[PDB]
Amino acid sequence: QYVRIKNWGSGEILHDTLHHKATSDKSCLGSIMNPKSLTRGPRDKPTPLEELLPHAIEFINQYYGSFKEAKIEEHLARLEAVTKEIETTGTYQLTLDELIFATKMAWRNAPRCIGRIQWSNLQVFDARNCSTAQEMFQHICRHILYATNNGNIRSAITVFPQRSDGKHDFRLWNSQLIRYAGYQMPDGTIRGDAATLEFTQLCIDLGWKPRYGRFDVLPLVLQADGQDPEVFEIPPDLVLEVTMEHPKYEWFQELGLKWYALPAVANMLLEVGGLEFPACPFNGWYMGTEIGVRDFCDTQRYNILEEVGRRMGLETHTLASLWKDRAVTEINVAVLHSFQKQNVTIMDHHTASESFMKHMQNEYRARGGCPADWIWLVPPVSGSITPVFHQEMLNYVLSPFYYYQIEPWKTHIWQN
Amino acid sequence: QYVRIKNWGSGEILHDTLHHKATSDKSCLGSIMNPKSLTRGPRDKPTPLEELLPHAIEFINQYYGSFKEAKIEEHLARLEAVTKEIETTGTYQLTLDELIFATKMAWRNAPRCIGRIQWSNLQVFDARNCSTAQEMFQHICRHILYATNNGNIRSAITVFPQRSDGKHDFRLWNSQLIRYAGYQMPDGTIRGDAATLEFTQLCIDLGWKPRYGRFDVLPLVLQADGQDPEVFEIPPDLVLEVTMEHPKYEWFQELGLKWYALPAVANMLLEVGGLEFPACPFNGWYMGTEIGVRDFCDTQRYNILEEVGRRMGLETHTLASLWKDRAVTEINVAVLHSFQKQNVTIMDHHTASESFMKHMQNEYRARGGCPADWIWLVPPVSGSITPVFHQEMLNYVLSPFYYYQIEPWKTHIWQN
Ligand code: HEM
Ligand code: HEM
Ligand SMILES: C[C@H](O)[C@H](O)[C@H]1CNc2nc(N)[nH]c(=O)c2N1
Ligand SMILES: C[C@H](O)[C@H](O)[C@H]1CNc2nc(N)[nH]c(=O)c2N1
Ligand SMILES: O=c1[nH]c2cc(Cl)ccc2o1
């Protein structure tokens, strides 16, 4: 009938019925980073018609069923037209409106996103007519420019040509549009973003000139029509950055830290009505903790925690002193302070959490559920201090959906 | 063959093979508080022999297989003796050594416990010969006294008579041995521990005299041999408490806060070799965040966060100011400072996390795995600041195991 869901903070109860529309798929794979269930791999043959048509019809019904004032006439016509297109072409092209609807629903269906209250506010760039890498690059630049909007960040997505037979896939090898390089310096020490070590090397192996700095913006590695990836440097004028300053600690800027203002996922796949889009970069704005906690404090990243500790005069040699808790908060304060001062959009984790709670409440009232991955929705700091922590959630895959993809360099067949 | 497990912090890889010995058991029930899979309900008939014997043999093999220098001779004898006891009595009695081994293994197999590095260090009190509530009370007092040890906390467990036919179950109605009462005051305001509202009332409905205070230690509600529960007040001399003081904020003690030093689970069930023990209270020592973050800062608990905020002179009306992050840390500092000052055992969450990481490493080397519930192992604060956050985990039920039980007052048949 329905799964009961409880919020131990307010005591409120919710009835999840939306999970019934969930898709497919050896203990409980609880904290697995990239599970196969969330990954949509490559293909070497077109989608079997017996599979395509059913999913296509399913989607067309969802699209027309979303309207307040039904359009039965148009609905029936679309159903017939789509079927014919599949019969005569082996696939089908979404109408601009359908695609727009799809991108928003896929975001709406992203269990790991805390910013889904903004789901309906998304600019869509239709690049399904793209043909070359140079063209992809131009589209991406236009995207970055529009999204950055001089600090007033705007959520957007660029949709490239859908997968045909799987041999002509459009793909962005980057994990994110804007990302810093990681260098394995001569003196053994790691420089820049340690998480991009391998990818940085690949860029170098493709002709990119390494600048061996702490914040070197990596180039776009674009794969068009299944062909070999081309390297393109992102024009610096398009990469907006924020220099890190603390409202009280003047020595904070002496750290020489900064970060980009545009968080943009670049390697995911959009699934809709049986169709797959291997290239569809999208972006939103930052939530403070991503930079201050993950990027700056993870040991596998910039690992600046101990340094900020000493500077504060804390007992960095005694864990029980809770110096780490004290340091990380000041870094978070710095990140938020800097973005606000430099007029660049950002939201603290507390405001974000509440916003999601409101969204979830809205989703249950609208469709009886909201797919949520607790492990990702709970901030990397102040866990139980946020309401999301006390909220029971159900994680399930719907459609449309944004899937992970296998690393392109592991399945790509080089032309030369 | 084996499930691959990765630690994104150190990059280390682990091979889990232990999950193959997992037991039994509609989307992914990710953040469910009390799932049925972790609950072992009541019975009205003895364990079917066809089920009992197999589990019994399985356990006896595990027990003897744990020894370094094997005791094949004794092993075979025990196997035969257990079988006969079941044939002639319909069940079997564990030897003291077996039970001791069982309690430690069940703890070792608790996916939600961060303190499992101490698994082998556990005192066992055999109360399987208990008969009356008064006797249960005496055993519990002895437990509390031994465990408290004048602040030098010691982990212990008291094992009551195993379930026979399910109609003569020994049960502790309390969720924890020591817990504060929650009163629904006349002026509408909640007083004490808001989480014990319902249970507090039940105690009152059974003859307990409410003292309407902020920290009133609830009485023991004991059920012996399936009979009606009796109320027993815990002797105050046995309840050690810590008054909350801040190392710098002198106004902190003006808050009049305090907490008990003994964390003891009282309502869980021990499953071993087909046998079930509905009453087996156990305890360890506190990890700071349980008191400072959950008990003191949860809105459904003492909710002292805003109060500590103003006292600090923070912008408690602006979420983005991160006042909550600042306040909660000082409370955590207070809790740790007070326990240490009053010589009462306690461990901060950072030291606890590392300790578990070492344990997990030890478990994979010893038996190729360690059942872990990421959602419970990650501290309520400083999530990603701890190593546990970046460690992938596999959650599964082994045997022996500590299961949850259905609330006794919901299935109990009152005598009069
Ligand atoms: C408007 C502001 C937005 C905010 C503040 C936001 C924030 C977040 C955060 C904090 C995460 C976790 C990232 C990580 O830990 O790696 C996340 C994940 C995600 N978001 Fe959002 N998001 C926003 C917009 C978007 C948009 C526009 C889309 C899609 C059209 C979206 C799709 C997703 C997806 C698919 C994930 C999962 C990525 C992964 O698993 O690596 N988000 N988001
Ligand atoms: C030696 C110190 C110990 C520490 C610091 C420790 C700490 C913890 C913590 C932090 C939790 C989470 C509690 C919550 O959020 O409600 C937990 C859960 C648990 N612990 Fe430990 N523990 C210790 C000893 C023990 C012992 C001696 C046993 C068993 C013999 C044990 C069995 C468990 C079980 C079964 C749970 C789950 C309880 C539940 O799900 O409500 N722990 N422990
Ligand atoms: C192992 C663990 O799943 C991993 O480190 C996680 C958990 N929670 C997360 N939560 C978010 N938001 N983002 C992440 O990258 C992760 N990583
Ligand atoms: C809904 C959610 O599962 C619940 O609030 C949790 C999550 N994580 C937890 N973690 C621990 N250690 N203890 C808890 O009580 C909880 N509760
Ligand atoms: O903080 C953020 N903002 C984000 C926007 C996208 Cl699209 C993904 C992850 C994010 O993390």
Ligand SMILES: O=c1[nH]c2cc(Cl)ccc2o1
């Ligand atoms: O902090 C703690 N210590 C604990 C000991 C047991 Cl047995 C259970 C939960 C605990 O939480």
